[PDB]
Amino acid sequence: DPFTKTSLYESTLKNQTDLLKVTQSTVEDFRSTNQSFTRALEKDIANLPYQSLITEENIINNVGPILKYYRHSINALNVYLGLNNGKVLLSQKSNDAKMPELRDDLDIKTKDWYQEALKTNDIFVTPAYLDTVLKQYVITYSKAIYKDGKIIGVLGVDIPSEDLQNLVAKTPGNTFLFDQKNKIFAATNKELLNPSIDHSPVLNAYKLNGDNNFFSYKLNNEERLGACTKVFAYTACITESADIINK
Amino acid sequence: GIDPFTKTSLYESTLKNQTDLLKVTQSTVEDFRSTNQSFTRALEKDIANLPYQSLITEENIINNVGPILKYYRHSINALNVYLGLNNGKVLLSQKSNDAKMPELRDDLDIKTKDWYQEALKTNDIFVTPAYLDTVLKQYVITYSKAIYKDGKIIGVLGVDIPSEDLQNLVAKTPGNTFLFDQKNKIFAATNKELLNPSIDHSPVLNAYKLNGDNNFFSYKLNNEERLGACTKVFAYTACITESADIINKPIYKA
């Protein structure tokens, strides 16, 4: 009876939509937490007297401890401050017992975290990239720090992208995230974390239907139902078997 | 007899969605606590990493511990971050006045407070169940840990996280979910009306007592049949409820 199928469809639509919202919120809350942290760190650095900021030795001794405490507080991989002379004051989890040091070898003026922070007055969030030091996908938050209009340097905070995957994986529903290049990034079902799998049908269905609009599509000639939505640069999706409406 | 609607696939999937949404609210509480516990452990490790000499006079405590409390407070936007001493003095870093450096106060009658006493009885973090502070006029969410240097007690670290943070996070979850404190008083809710003290929550709580965690039950309030489930989450009780006429939409409304 059309009435019963309709009732099942309307129900599963509302449920899957609600679950997609939870994954969307997960991404949002992760980002906002890390932005709030970065902003706080910016404010604490800029609050220092200029005398504490205008020699390299004073930067090491006065900013260094701040970087370290902040790093510890959130268990970040790296917290650092890049200067216009090319040097970086680096606080790193991998060398936790050593005081933060000035590194001159990180080629910072060719890096997007540095360059892009100077082109916006907001926090800049990098796409997830390989730290081929850390063997680890990282998301970097950066922010140019100004004291009374005067640039001090560019703050950078490295968070393991695994942290966001881990949060997504625990969400209800068969939810997952694509990055900017439509490649799988995070998933409830960890078996999806595999570049071999095609997602053309879901991506094509999303293309035709737009954000938060429930759709039908096919896998192995079986019907599935889903919805996707843009979340920042990500695409968040949920899919299920259509057996709930058909059987 | 058995309600025939309870045998439908639509009822089963409806209950599954309510279960999922209750678990979201459950996760919200768990993740908040875990984050705050980790923050507090990190803070204690940094304080204890100060050299012995920096931790043994009040002047040194002020000058060396103070900055760490303040940086940490800023990093997470805590309400208060503080170190209680045996003599009853507290080094207090407070949001409510951010311009000055943390100061020692003999102000606070701490040696008889749970956050202080309980931390001294355990190896790890003491979580003070959320409570409504009558004088401050809001819920307080406190984490505490005894700080030892070379095995000797320096004092007890305390961290107050804004209760609105968790209230707001609960509120934004999907579903008609809500949280009770340890005293079975309503603490957080998606439907902000539920927070009003004049709401009678006894029917939901009495039903829950007969049912156990995550098991659905019928109950009535003001002559409306409803369906609910609750679960313990630490000292809290998390519930979800819905009208019976939403769970099973009648073809003809009353």
CATH of the structural domain B30-165, one choice from 1.10.10.10, 3.30.450.20, 1.10.3720.10, 3.40.710.10: 3.30.450.20
For residues B144 and B119, give the distance between their C-alpha atoms in angstroms, rounded to a whole number. Answer: 6
CATH number of A27-159: 3.30.450.20
* Cα–Cα distances in angstroms (integers) from residue B238 to residues A25, A26, B94, B163, B170, in the given order: 20, 20, 31, 16, 10
Find the DSSP H helices in chain B.
Answer: 9-48, 58-60, 66-76, 114-119, 163-172, 202-211, 244-247
A-chain residues within 8 Å CB-CB of B13?
Answer: 8, 11-12, 15, 244
A-chain residues within 8 Å CB-CB of B34?
Answer: none
Looking at residue B116, its amino acid is Y
- Closest-approach residue (CA) in chain B for A37: B75
For residues B109 and B96, give the distance between their C-alpha atoms in angstroms, rounded to a whole number. Answer: 20
Long-range residue pairs from B69-72, CB within 8 A, at least 24 positions apart, any chain: B69/B43, B69/B93, B69/B102, B70/B101, B70/B102, B71/A44, B71/A65, B71/A66, B71/A69, B71/A70, B71/A73, B72/A69, B72/A73, B72/B39, B72/B42, B72/B43, B72/B46
Helix B9-48 crosses helix A64-74 at what angle (to 10 degrees)?
Answer: 150
Cα angle B27-B31-B37, degrees, rounded to a multiple of 5: 145
3 state DSSP class of B140 = strand
The verdict on a CB contact (< 8 Å) between A14 and B17 is yes
Residue A141 CA to its chain's centroid (Å): 9
The answer to whether A202 and A237 are in contact (CB under 8 A) is yes
CA distance B103 to chain A (A): 19
CA distance B126 to chain A (A): 18
The verdict on a CB contact (< 8 Å) between B74 and A43 is yes
Q: With 0-12 CB in 10 A as exposed, 13-18 as middle and 19+ as buried, what is A97?
A: exposed
- B193: alpha, beta or left? (left if phi > 0; alpha if psi -120 to 50): alpha
3 state DSSP class of A181 = coil
For residues A134 and A144, give the distance between their C-alpha atoms in angstroms, rounded to a whole number. Answer: 24
CA atoms within a 13 Å half-sphere pointing along the CA-CB vector of A226: 28
For residues B219 and B216, give the distance between their C-alpha atoms in angstroms, rounded to a whole number. Answer: 10
For residues B110 and A188, give the distance between their C-alpha atoms in angstroms, rounded to a whole number. Answer: 45
Q: What is the widest separation between alpha-carbon atoms in chain A?
A: 78
For tokens 């679950």, the residue is: A19
